[PDB]
Structure 1
Amino acid sequence: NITDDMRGELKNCSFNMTTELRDKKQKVYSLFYRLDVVQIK
């Protein structure tokens, strides 16, 4: 439910993060501010 901000200011992103064991990875998602992230989607 969004009244928003500057459009696109808040982003929903996901990635493969490392885990306690060297053998395994975990899928996570988190929210970022636009200022924290730059496009190389």
Structure 2
Amino acid sequence: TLQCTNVTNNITDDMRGELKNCSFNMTTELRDKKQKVYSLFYRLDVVQ
């Protein structure tokens, strides 16, 4: 599950909603640990 917000810092009118700032929990090298990370995804790559 991705928790996504809108990327709105220095975007043009034709880039609105095109990039998602998504934070998620991810596995680590140790099987018993999780890391909260984030990534920029494209609107075409994620579905609500």
Equivalent pairs, count? 39
Structure number with greater Rg is 1
Select the structure with the greater relative contact order (CA < 8 A; seq sep ≥ 6): 1
Percent identical pairs in the alignment equals 100
Q: Which runs of 5+ in 2 are unaligned?
A: 1-9
Structure-1-length-normalised TM-score: 0.81
Moved over 4 A (4+): none
- Superposition CA RMSD, Å: 1.3
Q: Which runs of 5+ in 1 are unaligned?
A: none
Structure-2-length-normalised TM-score: 0.71
